[PDB]
């Protein structure tokens, strides 16, 4: 027994052809069943043929004989059809609304996530539809993991350098960060653990959660986890006060906080406010101002992924007392200097995913165009707080969406929280770039800020853009531009004191030839948010709309704090690239 996802309309039947199995009441389980091909249909039992090596498990073509389920060609003379009078037989069959439409939970139940229509559904559906989406998506995503084939361990070329084996017929995952796999020891009866560890091009170069000598027979998979059922909505009833609520301000605060004093007392007056921090404008100085802002406040500070938990901490270290904060860690090598799994503490850092059930005063959820819908309920579920603040950039990168190939995701598509910023615009703005050249901020103001993003620093004179579209080769899964490294090479001979600049691209392969050639540190442009480097060299590589994307692209260039190359194979952003103009060799 439970609810219908549609009704809430209480009810005993949930449908078996659903990968989550939601709760659907007498109405909305027929509704479905008839206008989809889902068509088995779970109770306090499945509705299936109860018959002798039968395999009857349509509910349109099953009965009630006795208190057991029959097909028509196994039926007691003595039955009622399951599915019939605009109805499915179970428990609560007398309170059942039903809606005008299902049309939009039936696309939810059916589509296979490779359209960005998918998740554009997902996010201007209904708020209990949404929540359906979110584990519906989750569960497909972590489903499609499975669908990969084992890698083993054939021989150990080097250390750091490996030869992989692959189960035969079954695909081969991408081998860049996003895909993370476990590896495994073979023993007596079964397999245990040997750390996380990610994987890219020779043989094949490793990377992994720990050291080893792992040796020939050891294999691994891309780890899925349990996809729990969602219950609280991804964001709670927006509340406006007419006083700060539940929260005292300071009387005597610093003057490296002073620029936040407004949007602190915004947050203390909106049950909920979001805050678009683009690019080096002190989204974390903000989220651990507000502590000393208010100080007897319980502030748990959440992010999707432990580096963002972490920088949280790091930040947190340099201006809360030490004995007042705790990291929480479920039983990688995370933030080592608070107490840890202390959820009493006043100041409590932790990722989503391993949020404690507790209250606070605030809650501060960081990097926010990489939550999930999923993340959102989850925090909702987990944190009850008299408010919450959302710090993030819409226009920075959201979580990758490995099922998604037809379509891009606009911003206003990434969350609950984005969709609202791109939409009602966001509660607050930090409109000071304090990382980058002035060249840069007014590229980005321009692209994706609306001339609302202002530089502290000056023009540097040292941010330049060539049009150069070269030779794009294909490998497996990614891209490379070997004339658009040779170009760099040739910057570099003439141009040396660039050889303190990390390398950027949007495909880990070029960053490996790249890596090879001119000796650069490099990073994908997912990799590097949230990083930072005097001088950055960036090779576009292709004009897909891979590497178009306007997000990836004011990522790519604002990770520069002085001078930026930028080789571009895009006619369109090299021209928006507010940058001296060079020639070719
Ligand atoms: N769609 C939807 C949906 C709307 C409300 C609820 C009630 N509920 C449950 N947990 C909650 C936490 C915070 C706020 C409300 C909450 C559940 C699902
Ligand atoms: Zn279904
Ligand atoms: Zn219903
Ligand atoms: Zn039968």
């Not at 079964?190 to 990377?207: L, P």
């Not at 991804?234 to 002073?258: A, C, K, M, W």
Request: hydrophobic share 35%; net charge positive.
């Amino acid at each position: 027994v439970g609810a219908c996802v549609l009704c809430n309309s209480q009810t005993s039947l949930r449908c078996g052809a659903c990968i989550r199995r939601p709760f659907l009441c007498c109405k909305c389980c027929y509704d479905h069943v008839i206008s989809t091909s889902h068509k088995l249909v779970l109770s306090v039992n499945p509705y299936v043929c109860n018959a002798p090596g039968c395999d009857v498990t349509d509910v349109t073509q099953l009965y009630l004989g006795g208190m057991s389920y029959y097909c028509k060609s196994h039926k007691p003379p003595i039955s009622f059809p399951l599915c019939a009078n605009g109805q499915v037989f179970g428990l609560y069959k007398n309170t059942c609304v039903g809606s005008d439409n299902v049309t939009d939970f039936n696309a939810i139940a059916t589509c296979d996530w490779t359209n960005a229509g998918d998740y554009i559904l997902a996010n201007t559906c209904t708020e209990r539809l949404k929540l359906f989406a979110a584990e519906t998506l989750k569960a497909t995503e972590e489903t499609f993991k499975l669908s990969y084939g084992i890698a083993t361990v054939r021989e150990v070329l080097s250390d750091r350098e490996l030869h992989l084996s692959w189960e035969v017929g079954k695909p081969r995952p991408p081998l860049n960060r996003n895909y993370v796999f476990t590896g495994y020891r073979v023993t007596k009866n079964s397999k245990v653990q040997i750390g996380e560890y990610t994987f890219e091009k020779g043989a094949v170069v490793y990377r992994g959660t720990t050291t080893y000598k792992l040796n020939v027979g050891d294999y691994f998979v891309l780890t899925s986890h349990t996809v729990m059922p969602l219950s609280a909505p991804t964001l709670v009833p927006q509340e406006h006060y007419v006083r700060i609520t539940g929260l005292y301000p300071t009387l005597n605060i610093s003057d490296e906080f002073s620029s936040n004093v407004a949007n602190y007392q915004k947050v203390g007056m909106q049950k909920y406010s979001t805050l678009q921090g683009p690019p080096g404008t002190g989204k974390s100085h903000f989220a651990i101002g507000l502590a000393l802002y208010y100080p007897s406040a319980r502030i748990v500070y959440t992010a999707c992924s432990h580096a963002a938990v972490d920088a949280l901490c790091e930040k947190a270290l340099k201006y809360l007392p030490i004995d007042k904060c705790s990291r929480i860690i479920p039983a990688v090598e995370c933030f080592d200097k608070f107490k840890v799994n202390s959820t009493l503490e006043q100041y409590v850092f932790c990722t989503v995913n391993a949020l404690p059930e507790t209250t606070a005063d605030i809650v501060v959820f960081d990097e926010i165009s990489m939550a999930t819908n999923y993340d959102l309920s989850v925090v909702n579920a987990r944190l009850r707080a008299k408010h919450y603040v959302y710090i993030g950039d819409p226009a920075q990168l959201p979580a990758p969406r490995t099922l998604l190939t037809k379509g891009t995701l606009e911003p206003e598509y990434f969350n609950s929280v984005c969709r609202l910023m791109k939409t009602i615009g966001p509660d607050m703005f930090l409109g000071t770039c304090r990382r980058c050249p002035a060249e840069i901020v007014d590229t980005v103001s321009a692209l994706v800020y609306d001339n609302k993003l202002k530089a502290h620093k000056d023009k540097s004179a040292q941010c330049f853009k060539m049009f150069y579209k070269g030779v794009i080769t294909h490998d497996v899964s990614s891209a490379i531009n070997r004339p658009q490294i040779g170009v760099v090479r040739e910057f570099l001979t003439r141009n040396p004191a660039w050889r303190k600049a990390v390398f950027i691209s949007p495909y880990n392969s070029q960053n490996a030839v790249a890596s090879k050639i001119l000796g650069l540190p490099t990073q994908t442009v997912d990799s590097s948010q949230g990083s930072e480097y005097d001088y950055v060299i960036f090779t576009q590589t292709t004009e897909t709309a891979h590497s178009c994307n306007v997000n990836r692209f004011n990522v790519a260039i604002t990770r520069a704090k002085v001078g930026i190359l930028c080789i571009m194979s895009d006619r369109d952003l090299y021209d928006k690239l507010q940058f001296t103009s060079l020639e070719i060799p």
